[PDB]
Design a protein around this ligand. Structure first.
Ligand SMILES: Nc1ncnc2c1ncn2[C@@H]1O[C@H](COP(=O)(O)OP(=O)(O)O)[C@@H](O)[C@H]1O
Ligand SMILES: Nc1ncnc2c1ncn2[C@@H]1O[C@H](COP(=O)(O)OP(=O)(O)O)[C@@H](O)[C@H]1O
Ligand SMILES: Nc1ncnc2c1ncn2[C@@H]1O[C@H](COP(=O)(O)OP(=O)(O)O)[C@@H](O)[C@H]1O
Ligand SMILES: Nc1ncnc2c1ncn2[C@@H]1O[C@H](COP(=O)(O)OP(=O)(O)O)[C@@H](O)[C@H]1O
Ligand SMILES: Nc1ncnc2c1ncn2[C@@H]1O[C@H](COP(=O)(O)OP(=O)(O)O)[C@@H](O)[C@H]1O
Ligand SMILES: Nc1ncnc2c1ncn2[C@@H]1O[C@H](COP(=O)(O)OP(=O)(O)O)[C@@H](O)[C@H]1O
Ligand SMILES: Nc1ncnc2c1ncn2[C@@H]1O[C@H](COP(=O)(O)OP(=O)(O)O)[C@@H](O)[C@H]1O
Ligand SMILES: [Mg+2]
Ligand SMILES: [Mg+2]
Ligand SMILES: [Mg+2]
Ligand SMILES: [Mg+2]
Ligand SMILES: [Mg+2]
Ligand SMILES: [Mg+2]
Ligand SMILES: [Mg+2]
Ligand SMILES: [Mg+2]
Lengths: 463, 454, 443, 446
């Protein structure tokens, strides 16, 4: 058989939930203040109408209907229309400053029938315990509401507050009663930085993905969940070769970089990583293909000034409309946030080539787990969209395991030689091509890079 | 008495090994756990297996989920539900206030005693004893205390489920670990770095022996609860080929058909090439080959294989090759096994290949991985299949090593102005092998393993 | 939701505009965070920046004290009291008034026609009462009528622990719309002031903690460092090095001199600051290792004269200790002195000293924040770093090394990295004397 | 000895307790549910009535006398017969679904009736639950110990705990049943439980301080292992299974010796293990193999290849191969097992392949404890012990008597292997690094 589920509209949740929220049942959304219990509730009712024309009811035991509307309107949600259309109904159960319980419970049951709603929200189920001191009576009344909503065949979602993030499901023993489905939101503080996370603890009779998943409440978008579990090892590959910007490196790769590829350029500082990047993006704009560049080290001025000395004209291509130097700081937001910005501008720009510089900048202010998840998540999409990607990783050991993902590993190192700090290049991997296995000496000028001959008496330096 | 505490088996996979036979018969057992630990599933499976295998009718007393819901919830598992209920095989007694606007032994004792008598049951489940408290204290404890005695006299192997607040803390809510102090089974679902892991444990069995500690399990759909007792886990001179003939000579004839081979090295060394040759060997002779990729897409695998001179679509069309392809983060290792064991059972392969294990190491803890490789190597051995595992050495510039029969090792080597490669068969049980580190060249023909280094 | 610029440096950045206008915000924090000060800044800046009358109420302190406590900041608050820009309703218990005190508060708002308002310690009320009926009176008019009156309110509240509940007496339950958390985290034997906006129901904000500091002549100075490289070369101080660095250092460049002790890193800072003062340019030396005494003779022995640089007002030695405070506290003094000095060049000797007195992030945060300020100010910045990762943050890198040759430790210099220029890629011998550095031939 | 102690008969307690339980006073045996309070308490009575002819009385406030008889059966004591013989008396103080003052009188009479020298009150903590008088209960409990003291009986008074490393016992029974306190623990560490026993205090007498390991074996019960393990050594030599290595050692290994075979992967450590074992079975001796890496199938293939039939040896009862996973149990539970098999097969030689496999599933602390325990046990039992360790090339060193070092080494243009005896306490040893080869006839050193 199959437990039926109702798509939420919060794309990503439907993947994690394997369809949606069990229909005709109550789902408990628990979270500490600031998580996103209210927003999550409207999207459930918003898409409910703006897709399946399923009427919904919002019972607010806290914030005023007027404020609710104002708060939610910034997400581009015209709910005042749905109200006038008779799709949505906001029931004001918030007490006024200037039988109360049992009366409101029935005044709610009126709205569920009047609008004949299938997607109800009881916002702040905890706020009813912080209002009716007869909690014993409240609990008994809430148990009835759940059974009533069940008999009425409504897919309910009742929000609940928590005191601690990694502590109890919810307060006021609200874990029980509404205990068929339990979704937990969190906002954990770690390293003076916050991380919104969503978890589905239990689905009675249904299946779901198990664990926390990063989410974000984006303005003019809403709750955007991005499951790395959804990532499917089903990317496409081709034998079509692009250019690197350096014809010599293209010969060393046996024609050039494959279009459907991820290239790693490893090396110490001052080796010439942010050079092969410029040539990479330059090679695109030259052929008319659109390029990108997410800098996490140098400003546009510096990037352009560095590039102007090498013969690459950025401002031209930037204005011509074949380049988009994003440039930001790794410490500004978080990896989960950065990933969204990258993914956001990609679809907009529709780039032929992407280029991170560096990944090490990002790794610094993260975890070994967080960095992995980021790297694993970002590489996949690029390969899914068939966008050629170059990634820069510094070697703090001047003279992570991202190489497992990358198809091409280009190593740039320094080589001391008779009072002369020379430079060496080698292609370590090409995945699907013949590459030159030779450690060639190269030199940088205002002309670019000149990959020369091997060191012959090459002191075993590389690797 | 002179009655050694008999252990009635429950069928549920692993528990009967962990419980040294099964649940103590003629007694109650506490299946405690926080929300979503799989107590309801555990309880039903106990009953279900009862009525099917041992033909012992069972009664299910619910104090939360309505009978109709329970039937629908346990449906996807593929167990018969209404088929059994509509035959006096199973009985779901409801004690959850069906309505409200109402207000003991009236809604207990006899109701269950009747059910046991009516359906002639030998197994019973009391779902959520903790629910009684929320609904209806010292009186409730008395009734529940008498129920354990009544059920003992009636002679029924009972399971009494309860809830917990914390995973690593008090055994059960409302000190039910006193009313049903005798047999305790703990189910836990621990956070563990944003990655939930289910586990099962028998804290105590009064009068009998049991496997101590936490054992992992999974609540799969078409199956139910499956516990993996890595503890419980407990013959050929036929030499098979590798794909590379000179590597076979390095092994002294080839690989044994009943063996696990490890291939370790950094990226770009040529582990995937050896995999494509390993499988090609099977497809050539007319054997079957299964590949589990966790790193490269089905396309890229084929592309890079075609460049080496190895058509897989030919073999995949022949039905001698199958490629899985799945990111490790898709599910957990506990579920990954279940799937691997499924396609092996179905495809009935000769050679297997997991490329790579190192990709699966990132979606688990050390303990979780070690338990995984033990389970996979065991299954592969039990199914009489040659196996090749691959691992990336964090050596760009163990456990499997101890389990694997052959350890092949790939490495980069600088040759003065050139970056070369080298193969070495570090170990091979029950054969002479070439103990030298040797240069090899990758080409559009394959792997030309050549002269040794010094 | 509209926002009203607070006027607090850095908050309007993190708050993405300001505080939800016409809505109350909760400034929760433990004693000694800066709740009382933050509240005054709001009412203050507003009045001055845009005549928006405000009423401060105090259930704890008394106005005569409050005025004097905020006098150092340089806010003529008496004038506001007379002209009727600011008010101070003393609801502090006299060494009842459930409706009385609040009714008095409502009147003042109507009288002065206040747009801003502050309730200093909404917690105190609970302590300075009897029944928790205060909850009603707080979720009453206090908030509701404030919304009806259309005033942006700040309800200050106390907390017990830094990383615990949002408030003491479940004050959040009432003021549950917008919340701001101030903290004094301690950790180590130093203390860290950080500000976080946990919730702006309806609007967005920069998520997480952000460093802030109460300076005696400014107040809360939140630093949201989360928020034009020229081609004019300057002399390094040593001519051979200038040639090695392709004519000299870019004015918009971060130079990193790296090496052991005895290599000659402080020789190259002395030369660096010297070149500025020579050509009438300001130079500020941040000393973490050495002292005004050690430096003076160290320079004199090399043949530089800070004596006349002190007379000319060209050189400026701060000279402090890394363990005086955390890294957050350090940058302030330099950030301030820079404005007072207008430094063409500036140096930090050393950074390894500061790196020892904090965690990786603390250093990282300092590194990034330090580079920016001067980078966004047009001034050449040299950095000394002892070698027992600003290698990727720095533009130019100089590597000094001891080389053991023939049982006679020699000295060697090399420019490893320089963005935008050709650098000399030879490892040159150098000598030290009473004149300075003598960069010679390579090995 | 100041105060008199009564031997409990439990294996190990009498050692750690320096005699037994202080006689004429009550002892508290506290622990979380499933620690083994009841079993411990019964073995106390059982050995009393049997070995020492001291009658015992069991007072149960939880489990039914009938159940106790059934639960305590597999251990193999005829408790039912001895209840009839007038030695044992299980007082049913268990509550009925539908006054402690009188209940105490019932227990008091039983002691005087049977002339009990030993008494067990099971779960005092229960009493506080069953009867919610609190103060009234505490008083009667204080009167119980007072009365029991006068009649000169040695009492065990059990109590439940919540947390393992938390309070001594619930309901502060500590205050009443002070004087002597024993704590049983069952700690989950790495998804693996650890049974421990500790004498926190003995007022008046000495005892071994700290936790000690124990187990509950189905056919024996509580078996405590005083890790504090008084020996015998001689110039009696024994074979290694390889004649050249015997000559390298100086006429074979010493008998009572711990040998270590360290080396890289594929050197030949398991080979030496297989020969070491054969060296016993081929020279009329018994061998134990604790395999923590290879399965049976793998151990056989290696043996059959090198020309050794372990099956015959096992059929003739000369060899025992355990085969275990390091992750199955904890290392403390692993030793207990090893000791258990030794005290059954009574092996002349013992081999563990390998210690490095055990190190994976244990902390440095735990590994040391294991290595120390195993070494000390083999030497007190006077058995010849070999151990293998995987070393980088592809602390037992200090404790071991012999160190054989296998290594990869190039020579005449060939990557070959070599052996080197590094240590031999009480003998010359060839201090030369000799190359060797492996074949179907085992090792060949040359
Ligand atoms: N219009 C908006 N634009 C951006 N972020 C918003 C918007 N509205 C709310 N948020 C974010 O959502 C968070 C939680 O909002 P809400 O769901 O109302 O709170 P809670 O989950 O505590 O009930 C806020 O802290 C804020 O960061
Ligand atoms: N029919 C089903 N199909 C798949 N997974 C199921 C099914 N029923 C339950 N589960 C899984 O089992 C988990 C817990 O099951 P359940 O026994 O209801 O929990 P508990 O006993 O803790 O209340 C659910 O969160 C879900 O992941
Ligand atoms: N005009 C130039 N002439 C010669 N070399 C230059 C020139 N501009 C830059 N370089 C070289 O480029 C190096 C910096 O390369 P870049 O890719 O920016 O460094 P990174 O390896 O940190 O990414 C400098 O150290 C210098 O050797
Ligand atoms: N057609 C080809 N001709 C020559 N060399 C190739 C060809 N295809 C791949 N190679 C080389 O062989 C290597 C084998 O890569 P692969 O086996 O996928 O590495 P790994 O198993 O370590 O992930 C490639 O990285 C590349 O250097
Ligand atoms: N006039 C001042 N000059 C300098 N620092 C001040 C001044 N007033 C307050 N501070 C700083 O702020 C702290 C008190 O801040 P305040 O807002 O009064 O405390 P609270 O947040 O507990 O109400 C002092 O300990 C000091 O660090
Ligand atoms: N007859 C038996 N056979 C085997 N093991 C037993 C037997 N009786 C008890 N045990 C062991 O003792 C444990 C329970 O010990 P018990 O005496 O009940 O302790 P407590 O009273 O502190 O709960 C069981 O879980 C099991 O490990
Ligand atoms: N029949 C055989 N003939 C020759 N050499 C063999 C034979 N069987 C095994 N070997 C070699 O001996 C090795 C045995 O190593 P082993 O005893 O398992 O030690 P380790 O534990 O260090 O791997 C094998 O790896 C292989 O190189
Ligand atoms: Mg809400
Ligand atoms: Mg760079
Ligand atoms: Mg349940
Ligand atoms: Mg591979
Ligand atoms: Mg204050
Ligand atoms: Mg110095
Ligand atoms: Mg007991
Ligand atoms: Mg071995």
């Amino acid at each position: 058989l199959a437990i039926e589920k109702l798509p939420t509209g919060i794309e990503g949740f439907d993947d994690i939930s394997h369809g949606g929220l069990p229909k005709g049942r109550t789902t408990l959304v628990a979270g500490t203040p600031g998580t996103g219990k209210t927003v999550f509730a409207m999207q459930f009712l918003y898409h409910g109408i703006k897709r399946f024309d399923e009427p919904g009811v919002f019972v607010t035991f806290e914030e005023s209907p007027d404020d609710i509307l104002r708060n939610m309107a910034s997400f581009g949600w015209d709910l005042q229309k749905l109200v006038e259309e008779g799709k949505l109904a906001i029931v004001d159960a918030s007490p006024d400053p200037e039988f109360d319980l049992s009366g409101l419970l029935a005044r709610i049951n009126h709205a569920i029938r009047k609008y004949k709603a299938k997607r109800v929200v009881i916002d702040s189920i905890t706020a009813i315990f912080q209002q009716f001191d007869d909690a014993s009576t409240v609990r008994r009344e809430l148990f009835r509401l759940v059974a009533r909503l069940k008999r009425m065949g409504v897919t309910t979602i009742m929000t609940a507050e928590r005191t601690e993030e990694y502590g109890p499901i919810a307060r006021y023993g609200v874990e029980e009663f509404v205990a068929d489905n339990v979704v937990i939101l969190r906002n954990v503080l770690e390293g003076e930085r916050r991380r919104r996370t969503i978890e589905i603890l239990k689905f009675r009779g249904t299946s779901h993905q198990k664990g926390e998943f990063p989410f974000t409440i984006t303005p003019g978008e809403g709750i955007s969940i991005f499951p790395l579990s959804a990532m499917r090892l089903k990317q496409r590959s081709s034998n079509v070769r692009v250019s690197s910007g350096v014809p010599e490196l293209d010969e060393m790769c046996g024609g050039g970089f494959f279009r459907d590829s991820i290239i790693l350029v490893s090396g110490a500082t001052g080796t010439g990583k942010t050079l092969l990047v410029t040539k990479f993006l330059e090679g695109a704009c030259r052929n008319g293909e659109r390029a990108l560049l997410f800098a996490f080290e140098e400003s546009r001025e510096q990037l352009l000034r560095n590039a102007t000395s090498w013969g690459i004209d950025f401002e031209e291509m930037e204005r011509d409309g074949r380049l988009k130097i994003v440039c930001a700081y790794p410490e500004s937001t978080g990896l989960e946030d950065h990933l969204i910005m990258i993914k956001e501008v990609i679809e907009e720009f529709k780039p032929d080539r992407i280029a991170i510089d560096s990944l090490s900048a990002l790794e610094r202010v993260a975890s070994d787990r967080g960095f992995r998840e980021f790297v694993i998540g970002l590489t996949s999409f690029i390969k899914q969209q068939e966008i050629t990607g170059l990634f820069t990783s510094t070697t703090p050991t001047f003279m992570s395991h991202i190489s497992t993902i990358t198809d091409t590993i280009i190593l740039l190192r320094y080589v001391e030689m008779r009072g002369e700090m020379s430079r060496a290049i080698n292609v370590l991997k090409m995945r699907g091509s013949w590459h030159d296995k030779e450690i060639r000496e190269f030199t940088i000028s205002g002309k670019g890079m000149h990959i020369g001959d091997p060191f012959r008496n090459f002191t075993r330096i590389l690797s």
